[PDB]
């Protein structure tokens, strides 16, 4: 019954048409977006066609009072193909022409921006260790997990937050869900390029100090990771979030090493070891 | 007589043509912007038309010395419909043609950028509690208000500032308006997704320490909220501001709750309760 | 003989073709930029024309072996006017056609970005007090100056740096220019909207502590101001810099006030007072 | 056998098609990118051509059932040249027409964004001293290197990180690589314009305290520099990274000086001295 999913998205039921137009256009699925555009496209040409007929027989080589001919003319026009069979006749015809044109291009201008706006979304090539572990490092138990960059490009002034979420009681006895930042031995990495193992020493200041497994389940406590940085690939900021549940903490585990020396004597990164955690089994 | 409005915009009278072109173009109302563009469009084609006539009878199938014909030709040319009735004749005609073309597309290039520049502005889907309250939490009064995210998308590394603005006297006796940043128990929320109740404990460090209602009116003091964060919807930064007056502080009040358990046993959010503040009435 | 000019640009002599293409294109003056584009435009069409002639007589209604005809055809083709007199003939002709097209639009795509890149530069509407003053505020002498926003739109997350630059001697006796950032009583203003008077208290920590005028001239010391913030007008970041020399510090001065109460009882801003500094003259 | 290259890119062997489409498109060499686009272009027109043939003889003046004719028609249609020889016939023909158009325009919209996305990348004009030096400044040994801005434009709120990377042993005996950010006497420069000599005093807090050369080689330790700032040239953020190996530290060296006084008495910047380091040779 987790508040937060693994993908980091909160897991709640929300209780609530043209109001949020811009958001909605960037939020819709590509199929839909393309449809909408199409609809709009067809629609407006039809409208324009009617305008033509309305004037009445103002297009060269158009079957009299036929909406198709006018429509297709309108596309050839708006789109500025301007084949040349169907042509404006008389001031009224042409004014509508020079109006459509402008309309068409403006639409392109609007479509473009939407496209570009929705199209230009980078994604940190970042991979999260499927598990956390609690184990002794430098003489104090420490909670860790690790990120691997999935691309050759580097992430600059990357940094990460390790947030514990769990239930608490106020002195007043309000029983709420609280967020605790957890101090990391290293929270900034100005140049993140291969792997980073993040650590929260556990000492008298850690909100998870002297806590067993039993106690963690009991506060229904999870761990939320937010990573962010400036990706050289995109020359644009990127982020990535992940969440862990009490039971994805492997007590005493140790992340295996992904750094190797080749036969060649050249260093290397093996991603295969990335999700592997060493463990002592005591029968 | 408030210095700051609810929308957070300061409430002062300011005492002060082509100077600020770029700002103005992004600042104008869409109707106006479109008009301007249109004007510019029509205008330039007229100019071009004149250029054509000026050469004299250089367009196929054009009524001799008729501006309309030239004008409409110019549009068909500059929008590159290029129907094909009206056509250039001779070097002068065509040079003007190849000039217009380029002109037209440059205009598109300029129009586009403006459009995109004005078009691409997100808005945090954030709603502010209409009131603040001063109530005891964990043993110290605390001033609070709360934000609710209005969209399914999440806001990352969101954070908020609670600023008290009020009149003061210097030892030197300068009577000025000063801004105090009020320490919040929680000022960052790396993953804002549903509701956030912001709190400023009031203790010997709070500029509103041991202050009643009477004293607040007296310094003509208001409270300004700035919220900001990176919206996943837009993959871009968003902000929202709000302001409160002394009298929108509900002393002793408690925000009602918005988190529920369904019959189903599934957690939920209710945004009807959002503006509701519990209160004790003592006859 | 100032190191820094009033406009904040350093005042030094620097001692040093296709290398910096992108910078150069954004750095050039509009006339020039347009020329370059034009040149490129004309040029490429000429090249294309030659390609056509090179096939030989492959365009309908073209005077045999005539470059003009080919050239103008090439424009009508690359701008996609496609009038319809001059037309491709045979495979070679048309392939070149379908190649040009693509070329043309790609050029548009490149031109656009440049245009937009150079076009979309905001400027903080910020005005700097022409002078600084040193005077007692809240019981310690304080250096100050002030900014006024020149537009109705607000600046978010605005903040400012007050940097003293002056010559120093190392224990080793290196005589260098050093920068001292000066602690301001208020360095962030999450919502800058009208005027902000920035202050650097002078106490045992101020690098200008117990310094007279004489001593300031002597270290040839100046004061550099950098302001930056996110402008709601442009929905984009803005900055502004300014510099002051030792002699633009008005000792004992006090900035006059720009905030008024109207007859109406409505508050107001008078930016005429903005540069005015009160002063005591003692015969 | 360095972990990090001079360009700051980590020097490891990574061990691991349509997955990363957007990154890949921005990452590919211009030649390749253009090819891809071209391919896509040609391809889609061919597809469209087939669509035409498939209806069968629906284009005016088209050799019956010939792909070339259809193909070239398709381009004239999709690029909206619309010459006018080949023309749609009947409903099926034209619908495909009005579909292509839109398609073409959308492609432009997509191409543009890619172009602009890849095209609009600035590069800090920043040059790194080829060497570092360890030498006494103001009475404590200090590690330094220096940056020179290579362009007339200025970089705002520039700042730099000096990171030591070297192998260590945990008490638990884990032998890992660790990063130490090294406190710099000056880490921000709100207005970087000519040269900046960065310094890390070495004292009881420096992770390189009481370390000789021998000891540095031994921990296989390098030094990583990240510089970043907002470039006025591009009105956009820029960064630059560099790395140094133990052996590019010139002990006792002193950077020569690049600031000069002209005969004219005007100050100047010479960048020939930039890489020059003074040294005492003791036979
Ligand atoms: K056309
Ligand atoms: K066209
Ligand atoms: K045509």
Do B111 and B234 fall within a single domain?
no
Contact of A212 with chain C, judged by CB distance below 8 Å, is answered with: no
C-alpha A86 to ligand 2 mean position (Å): 16
Contact of B170 with chain C, judged by CB distance below 8 Å, is answered with: yes
Residues of chain D found within 8 Å of residue C3, distances taken between Cβ atoms: 267
DSSP secondary structure code for residue A219 in this structure:
T
In the numeric block, the tokens 């087939």 are attached to: D50
Do D159 and D186 fall within a single domain?
yes
Q: Assign B214 to helix, strand or coil.
A: helix
Do C160 and C236 fall within a single domain?
yes
User: Which 3-state string (H, E, C) describes chain C?
Assistant: CCCECCCCCECCEEECCCCCHHHHHHHCCHHHHHHHHHHHHHHHHHHHHHHHHHHCCCECCCCCCCHHHHHHHHHHHHCCCCCCCCCECHHHHHHHHHHHHHHHHHHHHHHHHHHHHHHCCCCCCEEECCCEEEEEECCEEEEEEEEEECCCCCEEEEEEEEEEEEEEECCCCCEEEEEEECCCCCCEEEEECCEEEEEEECCCCCCCCCCCHHHHHHCCCEEEEEEEEEECCCCEEEEEEEEEEHHHEEECCEECCCEEECCCCCEEEECCHHHCEECCCCC
Nearest CA in chain A to C80: A81
Å resolution of this model?
A: 3.4
Q: Flag whether A12 is in a domain.
A: no
In the numeric block, the tokens 């106490």 are attached to: C203
Q: Closest ligand to A76 CA? A: 1
Interface test with A, best of D15, D118, D227 (most A CBs within 10 A): D15
> Quick one: how far is CA B130 from the chain centroid?
19
- The tokens describing A134, both together, are 């609690």
DSSP secondary structure code for residue B241 in this structure:
E
Q: Flag whether B46 is in a domain.
A: yes
Nearest to B14 among C85, C157, C269 (CB): C269
Let me know: does A122 contact D22? Beta carbons within 8 Å.
yes
d(CA A12, CA A5): 10
CB atoms inside a 10 Å sphere around CB B282:
4
Residues of chain A found within 8 Å of residue D14, distances taken between Cβ atoms: 152, 268-269, 271
What is the count of residue pairs from A and D with beta carbons less than 8 Å apart?
A: 146
Per-residue buried b or exposed e for D175-212, using 16+ beta carbons within 10 Å of the residue's own CB: eebebbbbebeeeebbbbbbbbbbbbbbeeebbbeebe
Please give the helix or strand (H or E) that residue B36 lies within, else none: helix B30-55
Contact state of A138 with D170 under an 8 Å Cβ cutoff: yes
Contact of A261 with chain D, judged by CB distance below 8 Å, is answered with: no
d(CA C218, CA B117): 49
Per-residue buried b or exposed e for B238-260, using 16+ beta carbons within 10 Å of the residue's own CB: bbbbbbbbbebbbeebbbeebee
Please give the helix or strand (H or E) that residue B26 lies within, else none: helix B21-27
C-alpha B75 to ligand 1 mean position (Å): 12
CATH number for the domain that contains residue C200 = 2.60.40.1400
User: What's the Cα-to-Cα distance from A52 to each of A89, B84, C123, rounded to whole Å?
Assistant: 10, 19, 46
What is the pairing mode between strands C13-15 and A222-231? Answer: unpaired
d(CA A130, CA A153): 23
User: What's the Cα-to-Cα distance from B267 to each of A243, B262, B264, D49, D142, rounded to whole Å?
Assistant: 18, 6, 9, 55, 58
Q: Which of D122, D155, D185 is the last residue of a domain?
A: D122
What is the pairing mode between strands D254-255 and D140-149? Answer: unpaired
Do A138 and A259 fall within a single domain?
yes
Do A181 and A192 fall within a single domain?
yes
d(CA A162, CA A200): 8
Do B34 and B71 fall within a single domain?
yes
d(CA A20, CA B238): 15
In the numeric block, the tokens 């084609």 are attached to: B45
Q: Where are the alpha helices (DSSP H) in B86-146?
A: 90-119
C-alpha A81 to ligand 2 mean position (Å): 5
Contact of D29 with chain A, judged by CB distance below 8 Å, is answered with: no
C-alpha A129 to ligand 1 mean position (Å): 56
Contact state of C268 with B14 under an 8 Å Cβ cutoff: yes
d(CA B177, CA B222): 11
What is the pairing mode between strands C188-192 and D132-137? Answer: unpaired
Residues of chain D found within 8 Å of residue A138, distances taken between Cβ atoms: 170-172
Nearest CA in chain B to C150: B16
Let me know: does A79 contact A104? Beta carbons within 8 Å.
yes
Q: Flag whether B7 is in a domain.
A: no
Q: Which of C166, C145, C172, C114 is nearest to C240 (CA)?
A: C145
Let me know: does C144 contact C255? Beta carbons within 8 Å.
yes
Q: Flag whether D28 is in a domain.
A: yes
Query: For C71, phi and psi rounded to 5 degrees?
Result: -55, -60
Residue D76 domain boundaries: 19-122
DSSP secondary structure code for residue A59 in this structure:
B
CATH number for the domain that contains residue D111 = 1.10.287.70
Do D215 and D282 fall within a single domain?
yes
Contact of B22 with chain D, judged by CB distance below 8 Å, is answered with: no
> Quick one: how far is CA A16 from the chain centroid?
24
**Neighbour order of strands in the sheet with C259-261:** B13-15, C267-270, C259-261
Contact state of B154 with A9 under an 8 Å Cβ cutoff: yes
Do D226 and D281 fall within a single domain?
yes
d(CA B56, CA B53): 5
CB atoms inside a 10 Å sphere around CB C6:
14
d(CA A201, CA A208): 10
Q: Assign B47 to helix, strand or coil.
A: helix
Q: Where are the alpha helices (DSSP H) in A56-166?
A: 67-78, 90-119
Do A241 and A269 fall within a single domain?
yes
Q: Is C100 left (phi over 0), alpha (psi -120 to 50) or beta?
A: alpha
- Compute chain A's Rg from CA coordinates: 30
d(CA D104, CA B80): 15
Do A66 and A163 fall within a single domain?
no
User: What's the Cα-to-Cα distance from A133 to each of A146, B232, C12, C277, rounded to whole Å?
Assistant: 10, 29, 57, 64
E-strand spans in B103-184? Answer: 126-128, 132-137, 140-149, 155-169, 175-181
Q: Flag whether D14 is in a domain.
A: no
Do C186 and C245 fall within a single domain?
yes
d(CA D70, CA B264): 61
> Quick one: how far is CA A152 from the chain centroid?
20
d(CA C178, CA D88): 75
Q: Which of A145, A152, A213 is nearest to A184 (CA)?
A: A145
The contacts of residue D89 (CB under 8 Å, 6+ apart) are: D57, D58, D59, D60
Let me know: does B137 contact A172? Beta carbons within 8 Å.
yes
Q: Where are the alpha helices (DSSP H) in chain A?
A: 21-27, 30-55, 67-78, 90-119, 213-218
Q: Subunits that touch chain A (at least 3 Cβ pairs < 8 angstroms)?
A: B, C, D
d(CA A239, CA D17): 23
> Quick one: how far is CA C188 from the chain centroid?
22
- What is the rounded (10 degree) CA torsion for D179, D185, D188, D191? -140
- The tokens describing C16, both together, are 């040093």
Query: Which protein residues have their CB within 5 A of the ion that is ligand 2?
Result: A 80; B 80; C 80; D 80
Q: Flag whether B14 is in a domain.
A: no
d(CA A59, CA A55): 10
In the numeric block, the tokens 């940085």 are attached to: A229
- The tokens describing A195, both together, are 């792997």
Q: Flag whether B10 is in a domain.
A: no
d(CA A223, CA D245): 38
Contact of B97 with chain C, judged by CB distance below 8 Å, is answered with: yes
Please give the helix or strand (H or E) that residue B30 lies within, else none: helix B30-55
User: Which 3-state string (H, E, C) describes chain D?
Assistant: CCCECCCCCECCEEECCCCCHHHHHHHCCHHHHHHHHHHHHHHHHHHHHHHHHHHCCCECCCCCCCHHHHHHHHHHHHCCCCCCCCCECHHHHHHHHHHHHHHHHHHHHHHHHHHHHHHCCCCCCEEECCCEEEEEECCEEEEEEEEEECCCCCEEEEEEEEEEEEEEECCCCCEEEEEEECCCCCCEEEEECCEEEEEEECCCCCCCCCCCHHHHHHCCCEEEEEEEEEECCCCEEEEEEEEEEHHHEEECCEECCCEEECCCCCEEEECCHHHCEECCCCC
Do A148 and A218 fall within a single domain?
yes
C-alpha C95 to ligand 3 mean position (Å): 18
- The tokens describing A158, both together, are 């990357």
Task: Return the bridge partners of D128, or none.
Answer: D147
d(CA D238, CA C26): 15
Q: Which of C8, B276, C6 is nearest to D156 (CA)?
A: C8
Let me know: does C251 contact C133? Beta carbons within 8 Å.
yes
Contact state of D80 with B80 under an 8 Å Cβ cutoff: yes
Q: Flag whether A245 is in a domain.
A: yes
Task: Judge residue B101's burial from the number of C-beta atoms within 10 Å of its C-beta, 0-12 exposed, 13-18 middle, 19 or more buried.
Answer: buried
Contact state of B269 with A80 under an 8 Å Cβ cutoff: no
Q: Which of C122, C144, C166 is the last residue of a domain?
A: C122
Q: Which of C107, C126, C129, C119 is nearest to C44 (CA)?
A: C107
Contact state of A84 with C80 under an 8 Å Cβ cutoff: no
Residues of chain B found within 8 Å of residue D80, distances taken between Cβ atoms: 80
Contact of B268 with chain C, judged by CB distance below 8 Å, is answered with: no
- The tokens describing C114, both together, are 């440049």
Task: Return the bridge partners of C147, or none.
Answer: C128, C196
> Distance from D278 to chain A by nearest Cα, in Å?
31
- Tell me how many domains chain A contains: 2
- The tokens describing A165, both together, are 């979420």
Contact state of C12 with D82 under an 8 Å Cβ cutoff: no
Contact of C44 with chain B, judged by CB distance below 8 Å, is answered with: no
d(CA B209, CA B226): 22
Task: Return the bridge partners of D277, or none.
Answer: D255
Nearest CA in chain D to A256: D174
C-alpha A91 to ligand 1 mean position (Å): 21
d(CA D111, CA D44): 14
Contact of D164 with chain C, judged by CB distance below 8 Å, is answered with: no
> Quick one: how far is CA D258 from the chain centroid?
28
Q: Subunits that touch chain D (at least 3 Cβ pairs < 8 angstroms)?
A: A, B, C
Q: Which of A101, A122, A143 is the last residue of a domain?
A: A122
């Amino acid at each position: 019954p987790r508040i937060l999913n693994s993908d980091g998205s909160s897991n709640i039921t929300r209780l609530g048409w043209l109001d949020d137009h811009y958001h909605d256009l960037l939020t819709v699925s590509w199929p839909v977006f393309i449809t909408l555009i199409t609809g709009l496209y067809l629609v407006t040409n039809a409208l324009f066609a009617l305008a033509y007929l309305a004037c009445g027989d103002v297009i060269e080589n158009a079957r009299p009072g036929s909406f198709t001919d006018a429509f297709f003319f309108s596309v050839q026009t708006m789109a500025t193909i301007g084949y040349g069979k169907l042509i404006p006749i008389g001031p009224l015809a042409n004014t509508l022409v020079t109006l459509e044109a402008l309309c068409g291009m403006l639409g392109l201008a609007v479509a473009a921006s939407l496209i570009y706006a929705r199209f230009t979304r980078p994604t940190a090539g970042v991979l999260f260790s499927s598990r956390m572990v609690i184990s002794d490092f430098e003489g104090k138990p420490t909670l860790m997990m690790r990120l691997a960059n999935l691309r050759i490009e580097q992430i600059i002034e990357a940094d990460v937050h390790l947030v514990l979420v769990r239930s608490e009681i106020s002195q007043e006895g309000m029983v709420f869900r609280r967020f605790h930042d957890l101090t990391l031995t290293r929270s900034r990495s100005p140049i993140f390029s291969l792997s980073w193992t993040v650590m929260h020493p556990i000492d008298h200041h850690s909100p998870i100090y002297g806590e067993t497994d039993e106690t963690l389940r009991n506060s229904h406590s999870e761990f939320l990771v937010l990573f962010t940085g400036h990706h050289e690939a995109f020359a644009q900021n990127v982020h990535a979030r992940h969440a862990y549940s009490c039971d994805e903490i492997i007590w005493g585990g140790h992340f295996v090493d992904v750094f190797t020396t080749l036969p060649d004597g050249r260093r290397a990164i093996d991603l295969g070891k990335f999700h592997e955690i060493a463990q002592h089994h005591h029968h």
